Design a protein around this nucleic acid. Structure first.
Ligand SMILES: N[C@@H](Cc1c[nH]c[nH+]1)C(=O)O
Ligand SMILES: N[C@@H](Cc1c[nH]c[nH+]1)C(=O)O
Ligand SMILES: N[C@@H](Cc1c[nH]c[nH+]1)C(=O)O
Ligand SMILES: N[C@@H](Cc1c[nH]c[nH+]1)C(=O)O
Ligand SMILES: N[C@@H](Cc1c[nH]c[nH+]1)C(=O)O
Ligand SMILES: N[C@@H](Cc1c[nH]c[nH+]1)C(=O)O
Ligand SMILES: [Mg+2]
Ligand SMILES: [Mg+2]
Ligand SMILES: [Mg+2]
Ligand SMILES: [Mg+2]
Ligand SMILES: [Mg+2]
Ligand SMILES: [Mg+2]
Lengths: 147, 147, 147, 147, 147, 147
RNA sequence: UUUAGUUUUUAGUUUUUAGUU
RNA sequence: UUUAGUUUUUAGUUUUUAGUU
């Protein structure tokens, strides 16, 4: 059972969608035992989006820099979030479109049982469009994985 | 250009993820000229999700009950939101999974230019899982279309 | 090299899109050595579409009733035509949509070299929509395979 | 209801597949109130196909050069047509294939009700193959959207 | 680094493909620390394939019967194996096809480093075809996930 | 009906997975009437994988170097094998991943009936991962087509 | 065709048939 | 979870969290 006060998906999205200039939303999350990182990336290359999220997560200590296990979990969470952003073909520049995104990676246990271990959420919010400023609409995605 | 105070996708999501008893977020949105609809649907059949969103939207007057044009726009917005929810295969029961969702449909012009006309956002949030309570994690999707 | 007078795809489509009450377009094709069949099918189940095309093709002698080889070629041609019709998810009723189609299956060699053997084209034209008459638009697909 | 004499998809395809020198099919269509555009594009990059269709459509006045609304409608119509052409993965050069295409974009109201507004059809026909002349077969795609 | 003698994917496939040496191959794998499960399932419903693998895995103790974490890992491994089997649309009966499969689930650490923890491989081998005996060819899939 | 002793898919995989008995396994297969080709390719570009398999197949005489028919069959077999390898998006470097593969192409008739003609199996085995040695797991794919 | 490989701090312009491993 | 299986002559109505293998 998902713990009602620890919904990692909902929390990662709330964090992304906040613009309160003095927030410390990160501080509260960290106090409650979550590992958190925020970033921004814009590209016509999906691999640049994936790379920014991985590099931010490893530098901020949200996932282990050593070994494959945690990188594997984060890659597949990122892929799942990209589905929401790309909506059928995981392609950007090759389909004459570009994205500008803010992202959040949240790590912790969202369940009632401490046996469920750590899980990870990757959330993405921004715009996708033709490569001409203004010819764009909003885009979102969330991917969740065990870690 | 997207009008900063009129970001239809972000607004539909914030509406979805807020859990206030005396809220009236719907009142304020309608008071800013938005057409708004909230609902809930849980199913192992995608078609039931699509139908709830359509039926809710037509009944609350978010889209026209007559004609195809607006139904067409909402169907494709719904499909796009379902991508984020299903993440690769737009199947539920046939892949031994079930969803419980809250949805929001928001209709209005998110651009600076009045000439961009109305657009529609369909936003979905809930859980997806094995058909056993608790064997689930969060899921999310947003689709945006012109109308 | 494709023979300019034997373009199996273009020919199958021209045949489908003709409504001339007295045509004998089939007779000319057959005189030029093509094997041809025409049919109609409407459904919310893709398997019913596939079945109608196979059963028509086998009854009209466009493909062999015995053995797997030709059935295999026709199945994969049908799948390719369905991509054009479904445009991302090869689902009908589960996504709250229905199709009504006319189809053509053409069999013969469209190349300059007689060594290229027989090929097959499956073409589909009709409407796809919500299950309410009139809430629909046109749909098309063509699949081509060696046989 | 689709108006029998105004089937935008069928009309765009017939325009695409006819090869008359003194034709003026474009003249008759424009004389029935349609906005019409024909072109050719060959590439190993999908983005070049998308761009040719957009650039042709804007230049011939089939869609507005200003604003996003009509560009958005045409992009998604183009994506839908590309499904029929690519049949599973919306990739060309990265999968060692190339396309040579003719395209038609048709704009107008295909319904009985004037209230359905304008719709757009993008139709594509040509060959897809290995990057060696002659190692190819026909390909086809149609996408339809409200505008 | 993958340990040469602990390649979980290759080992799971070898187990599946030997119908000579089953009884003691399982013995040897379990001796080396692997958790192992073998089974067979045939269906026109993907959900029945998924269920057979989960049920066999839990009953034979390859994954925890309690909690979600391990069920989640095995579900996504099974989805990945099913891609190889279905090759683009994760549908069986709805596309007029059926499968008969043998499956293997292997659990253990295939890496040099103990810190990589346990991983799981789901391997599938059999036939997919029209629902007429003999109108079929072979099919294979392997999915690998961290657990 | 598939002939028990001529299962082209299973045979191609066994060939790939034995790094003990290569030299004379090829000899034995060729003795039994099979056309056989083995190779290796590593890349962040799918098109390089496709090309290596085609080039090896044509050079070793597994398929005709002349004409399109056999090239077409092998291309679609390779596409099917790649589904198992890529598991939902047929992309490598654009999704920040790389593969190192061994491959086998087998050609012959796996059925009881001579009338089924020749079929072709493309089998792939190796690793897919981040572009950092060791950050990888195993991958497999098999595609089967008539030729 | 003869096993691949290094990553963060919001992106961006476009027509007239393509092509070798 | 203890290997699946038969096919043509244009389709069709929909909200208030789902669930066992
Ligand atoms: N609207 C597109 C993005 C785009 C490309 N070109 C114009 N718009 C999408 O939904 O992804
Ligand atoms: N975890 C699956 C849902 C699920 C099915 N079975 C168990 N869980 C998903 O991401 O969609
Ligand atoms: N317009 C949908 C069909 C549809 C379903 N509901 C309404 N229309 C399509 O493009 O396939
Ligand atoms: N036949 C492929 C095109 C191709 C690539 N290489 C050879 N032919 C298709 O159907 O798209
Ligand atoms: N050939 C199909 C299976 C099939 C369906 N009908 C006939 N055969 C596949 O590759 O999945
Ligand atoms: N794990 C990925 C490969 C990968 C990319 N980055 C890290 N690993 C897959 O399953 O394809
Ligand atoms: Mg992986
Ligand atoms: Mg549509
Ligand atoms: Mg097949
Ligand atoms: Mg869009
Ligand atoms: Mg999941
Ligand atoms: Mg082809």
């Amino acid at each position: 059972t998902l713990h009602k006060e620890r919904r990692i998906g909902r929390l990662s999205v709330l964090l992304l969608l906040n613009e309160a200039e003095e927030s410390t939303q990160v501080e509260e999350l960290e106090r409650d035992g979550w590992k958190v990182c925020l970033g921004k990336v814009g590209s016509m290359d999906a691999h640049k989006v994936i790379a920014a999220i991985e590099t931010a997560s490893k530098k901020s200590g949200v996932i282990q820099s050593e070994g494959y296990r945690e990188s594997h979990a984060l890659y597949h969470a990122t892929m799942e979030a990209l589905h929401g952003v790309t909506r059928g073909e995981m392609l950007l520049g090759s389909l004459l479109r570009t994205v500008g995104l803010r992202f959040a990676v949240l790590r912790g246990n969202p369940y009632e049982s401490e046996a469920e271990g750590d899980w990870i959420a990757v959330s993405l919010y921004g715009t996708i469009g033709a490569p001409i400023k203004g010819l764009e609409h909003e885009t979102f995605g969330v991917g969740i994985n065990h870690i």
